[PDB]
Design an enzyme around this catalytic site. Structure first.
Site, PDB file in Angstrom:
ATOM      1  N   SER A 133     -70.040 -61.830  24.515  1.00  0.00           N
ATOM      2  CA  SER A 133     -68.911 -61.471  23.618  1.00  0.00           C
ATOM      3  C   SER A 133     -69.438 -61.286  22.189  1.00  0.00           C
ATOM      4  O   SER A 133     -70.029 -62.242  21.649  1.00  0.00           O
ATOM      5  CB  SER A 133     -67.799 -62.513  23.685  1.00  0.00           C
ATOM      6  OG  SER A 133     -68.298 -63.822  23.436  1.00  0.00           O
ATOM      7  N   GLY A 161     -68.216 -55.096  22.655  1.00  0.00           N
ATOM      8  CA  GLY A 161     -67.051 -55.600  23.404  1.00  0.00           C
ATOM      9  C   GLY A 161     -67.363 -56.953  24.003  1.00  0.00           C
ATOM     10  O   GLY A 161     -68.329 -57.577  23.553  1.00  0.00           O
ATOM     11  N   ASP A 205     -81.873 -45.801  17.220  1.00  0.00           N
ATOM     12  CA  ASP A 205     -81.482 -47.237  17.083  1.00  0.00           C
ATOM     13  C   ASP A 205     -81.770 -48.008  18.375  1.00  0.00           C
ATOM     14  O   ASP A 205     -81.086 -49.017  18.625  1.00  0.00           O
ATOM     15  CB  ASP A 205     -80.014 -47.392  16.666  1.00  0.00           C
ATOM     16  CG  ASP A 205     -79.691 -48.737  16.018  1.00  0.00           C
ATOM     17  OD1 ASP A 205     -80.589 -49.332  15.422  1.00  0.00           O
ATOM     18  OD2 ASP A 205     -78.548 -49.163  16.107  1.00  0.00           O
TER      19      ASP A 205
END
Ligand code: 0EI
EC number: 2.7.11.24
Length: 352
Positions: free
Chosen positions: A29, A33, A146
């Site tokens: 978490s 999401g 990234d």
């Protein structure tokens, strides 16, 4: 309708999923999401389920969520995320709140792998698969920019998938209210210094990962781009005048005005103490690994090795397979949160 779905509290979050998804347990978490493990009773296999809460709630979450859904459909490769399923429990655009993403369950991310000693067989196979994935994206016209351990996952059998498709072609302002802090330790000098880039921008990130696998520490830590740049030049040395000339005159001003550093040789940066190098096999693989690091961790992209050349390097090339390497294969959008909701809903429902 909604009797197709049930609700269970996975830790802090409520997951409302299709009744085929059973025995939910929380994995992660955070920013993207919340993720859970489940058993899929229809396919009789273990899956990962990611919940996006109101991904249309700001233009950063929204652009990322949309890009990811769309780009999934442009990629067909075992080293890149494939979706088994996407769904929303809500029945109209008006009610639309959450998107759920389903894929094959993996065992770990590359953060956990980095905390382990790997032999040369596993390290080179992981690097090989990363390069196969990146080549697939590059051939689809996707340059990541990234790549990082936390968005790369592996199974016990040493098979690897990249989970995300990186930065927007143009991102601009990416402001968000959160304690959620973005990790930039693996970003190319091109990214950090706001230069032009080509495909081998992603080779720098593989370098930073490979280096971290060997050292078991982040190569280029730092609070911000300032710290990060200092850590880069302290180790690799001030880049040649040639490279400065390619900088905007104002970043150029900053960079050319830092204290000069000679920089360390790759033997110093990655001593023999860090290497499996007992047998003759392991000594040779140790020198080949260092040789590849020295070609990937190059500040000037005009002097940095390409994906195609890294795949031909003796450390990697033992795995080379035409089927995995030569497998054949939006960003310019700015919307209100109302328009994003619609775009994302149509993509989930597959309405257009
Ligand atoms: C970028 S975040 C992310 N998004 C997805 C995703 C999922 C579905 C999609 F359709 C698309 C994406 C995934 C994903 C995709 C496929 N499989 C997985 N598997 C999986 C299995 C084990 C595991 C991890 C992930 C990640 C780390 C992890 C987290 C946790 N949580 C804890 O709190 C552990 C210990 C806490 N302790 C310190 C108290 C406990 C075991 C952990 N160790 N390894 C994850 N990930 C991680």
């Amino acid at each position: 309708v909604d009797n197709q779905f049930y609700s269970v509290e996975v830790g802090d979050s409520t997951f409302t999923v299709l009744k085929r998804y059973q025995n939910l347990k929380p994995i992660g978490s955070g920013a993207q999401g919340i993720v859970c493990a489940a058993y899929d009773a229809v396919l009789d296999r273990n899956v990962a389920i990611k919940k996006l809460s109101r991904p249309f709630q700001n233009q950063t979450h929204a652009k990322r969520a949309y890009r990811e859904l769309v780009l999934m459909k442009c990629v067909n490769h075992k080293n890149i995320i494939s979706l088994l399923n996407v769904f929303t429990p809500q029945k109209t655009l008006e009610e639309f709140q959450d998107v759920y993403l389903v894929m094959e369950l993996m065992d770990a991310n590359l953060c956990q792998v980095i905390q382990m000693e790997l032999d040369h067989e596993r390290m080179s196979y992981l690097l090989y698969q990363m390069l196969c994935g990146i080549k697939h994206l590059h051939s689809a016209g996707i340059i990541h920019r990234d790549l990082k351990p936390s968005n790369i996952v592996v199974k016990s059998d040493c098979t690897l998938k990249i989970l995300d498709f990186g930065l927007a072609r143009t991102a601009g302002t990416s402001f968000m209210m959160t304690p959620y802090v973005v990790t930039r330790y693996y970003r190319a000098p091109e990214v950090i210094l706001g230069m032009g880039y080509k495909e081998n921008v992603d080779i720098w990130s593989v370098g930073c990962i490979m280096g971290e696998m060997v050292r078991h520490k982040i190569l280029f830590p730092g609070r911000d781009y300032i710290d990060q740049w200092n850590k880069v030049i302290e180790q690799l040395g001030t880049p040649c005048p040639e490279f400065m000339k390619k900088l905007q005159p104002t970043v150029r001003n900053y960079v050319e005005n830092r204290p000069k550093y000679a920089g360390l040789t790759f033997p110093k940066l990655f001593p023999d103490s860090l290497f499996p190098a007992d047998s003759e096999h392991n000594k040779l693989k140790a020198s080949q690994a260092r040789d590849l690091l020295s070609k990937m961790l190059v500040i000037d992209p005009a002097k940095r090795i390409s994906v195609d050349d890294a795949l031909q390097h003796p450390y990697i090339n033992v795995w080379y397979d035409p089927a995995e390497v030569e497998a054949p294969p939006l960003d310019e959008r700015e919307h209100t949160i109302e328009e994003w909701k619609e775009l994302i809903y149509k993509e989930v429902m597959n309405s257009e």
